[PDB]
């Protein structure tokens, strides 16, 4: 399973490099990252999991850059999503970058894949990182619904 | 490149085998079969391309089996649409088996992927095999519209 995850991520990287505008490489990366998750993370009071939040400075850098997105930025957001599986805000940014680069079909696939994931594991919508920041903000939640 | 196609197919096969209810492996197979087609086949009179139609006995076998669909049937249909990339009727049948076996998300994904391919190459809607049978039957066409 660990090696399979790696095989899927390498194949996804190759698909994405070759055709940034094609959805399937992006979908395969989501499967690689998420398919192994069958139980939601344990949590204490307030549904706070003992998992580190994304660095808010790292997140502010990506936010800043959305005024002029490029592949470099998009790659960093994607890499962050692969390292931080519950950072759902990253999928919203990623789809926003896709949309701004003219990759409509990829933006849509990114929304759908997060929707599918959350349909399988709905309890994830209620959980937070160790600092009380939500996996899924009310903004990301509304974005997904829309 | 050939080895890339084969790599994609093997990954796709293993994703489908492990999780037959999960869309992404089916999607990966489509990309493998179709991504290298940027031009539609040449044709002569009657929009007949010089490509062999699917064996009618083979198709009669799959249709008869739709009475009691199983994994074996589904695999054969899938193998056939891998070997015969323009046999769109086979996607309809695949999605019908998916539906019947309770895999609705997969059925939907099969429809989406074919509509996507047809959006990229719309002249494929007007072509036929060497005996005049259409790449896209009116039945397949109606299924996509639904």
Author numbering:
A (entry chain C), B (entry chain D): 231 to 376
What did the study's authors say about this model?
Contractile bacteriophages of the family Myoviridae (i.e. T4), R-type pyocins and the type VI secretion system (T6SS) of Gram-negative bacteria are evolutionarily related nano-scale injection machines that puncture target cell membranes using a shared contraction mechanism. TssA subunits are enigmatic as they possess a conserved N-terminal region of unknown function, previously identified as ImpA_N (PFAM: PF0681226), whereas sequences located C-terminal to this region are highly divergent.
Each monomer folds into a cluster of seven α-helices (α1–α7), the arrangement of which is very similar to that of the EAEC TssA2B Nt2 domain (RMSD = 2.0 Å) as determined by structural alignment. Specifically, the related regions include helices α1-α5 of Bc TssA1B Sd1 (i.e. most of the ImpA_N region) and α2–α6 of Ah TssA2A Nt2. This similarity suggests that an ancient gene duplication event may have played a role in the evolution of the Nt1 and Nt2 domains of TssA2 subunits. Following refinement, these dimers could be seen to be essentially identical in structure to that of the dimer formed by the isolated TssA2A Nt2 domain (RMSD = 0.4 Å).
